[PDB]
Enzyme design. Structure first.
Site, short mmCIF file in Angstrom:
data_model
loop_
_atom_site.label_atom_id
_atom_site.label_comp_id
_atom_site.label_asym_id
_atom_site.label_seq_id
_atom_site.Cartn_x
_atom_site.Cartn_y
_atom_site.Cartn_z
N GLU A 182 -19.35 11.06 49.03
CA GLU A 182 -19.29 11.66 47.70
C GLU A 182 -20.55 11.38 46.90
O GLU A 182 -21.07 12.27 46.25
CB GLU A 182 -18.06 11.09 46.94
N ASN B 112 -19.62 21.26 38.98
CA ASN B 112 -18.85 22.22 39.81
C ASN B 112 -19.15 23.59 39.27
O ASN B 112 -19.42 23.79 38.08
CB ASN B 112 -17.36 21.90 39.74
N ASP C 28 -17.19 25.78 38.49
CA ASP C 28 -16.20 26.20 37.51
C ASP C 28 -16.37 25.58 36.11
O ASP C 28 -15.53 25.82 35.20
CB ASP C 28 -14.78 25.98 38.01
N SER D 148 -16.53 22.32 35.30
CA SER D 148 -16.26 20.90 35.34
C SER D 148 -17.45 20.16 35.95
O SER D 148 -18.33 20.77 36.50
CB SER D 148 -14.96 20.64 36.10
N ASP E 282 -18.30 16.32 38.26
CA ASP E 282 -17.83 15.18 38.99
C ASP E 282 -18.67 13.94 38.65
O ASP E 282 -19.93 14.05 38.58
CB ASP E 282 -17.92 15.44 40.51
N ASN F 40 -13.39 14.32 38.94
CA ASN F 40 -13.60 15.59 38.24
C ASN F 40 -13.06 15.60 36.81
O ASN F 40 -12.00 15.04 36.52
CB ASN F 40 -12.97 16.71 39.03
#
Lengths: 128, 62
Positions: A35, A46, A48, A50, A52, A59
């Site tokens: 990650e 992201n 969309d 959002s 991380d 998220n």
């Protein structure tokens, strides 16, 4: 903070992740590797809207508040910045909620790189 | 089965075979799906949820 592999393993063990919801320690180490490359300060938008955050790339839609994500649930009741600390406490506690309703399938890196593999290899050679 | 939902205002459809994680939040069901090897996110009300998704949540809830 960029953790070493065994350094992170020892910290995650002290924080109670070994066998947490049936996931042995190496699962958590392996997931962090893929990650964030063991970097607490990692952040990644992201597509969309959002973002991380942190060593486990948690998220902003559901778990933490970053002030710029529509429809934020903030289930871990923390600013996302808390997930960037050198102290992994906030990330661990939030990860435990994600897995306590399920499992490590929540993490793309875990599905793609860890699941089905010899994850104990990630903790071999470490003083635990 | 498809899960039809709006996300960023725009209409999305995801196959339940791609859903990997499900959680209840109030009157909503949250889900993560495999989006061509990355995480995708969605939610739908429990009343609008396809029964196949409800089945997944029931299995998760033990």
């Amino acid at each position: 903070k960029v953790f070493g592999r065994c350094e992170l393993a020892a910290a995650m063990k002290r924080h109670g992740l070994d066998n947490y919801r049936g996931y042995s320690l190496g699962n958590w180490v392996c997931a962090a590797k893929f990650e964030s490359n063991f970097n607490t300060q990692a952040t990644n938008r992201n597509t969309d809207g959002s973002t991380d955050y942190g060593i486990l790339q948690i998220n902003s839609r559901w778990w933490c508040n970053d002030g710029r994500t529509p429809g934020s649930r903030n289930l871990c009741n923390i600013p996302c910045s808390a997930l960037l600390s050198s102290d992994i406490t906030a990330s661990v506690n939030c990860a435990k909620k994600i897995v306590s309703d399920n499992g490590m399938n929540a993490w793309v890196a875990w599905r793609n790189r860890c699941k089905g593999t010899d994850v104990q290899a990630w903790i071999r050679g470490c003083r635990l | 089965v498809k899960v039809k939902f709006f996300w960023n205002g725009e209409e999305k459809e995801v196959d339940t075979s791609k859903i990997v994680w499900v959680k209840r939040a109030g009157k909503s069901v949250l889900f993560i799906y495999d989006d061509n090897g990355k995480n995708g996110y969605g939610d739908v009300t429990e009343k609008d949820a396809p029964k196949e998704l409800l089945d997944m949540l029931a299995r998760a809830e033990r």
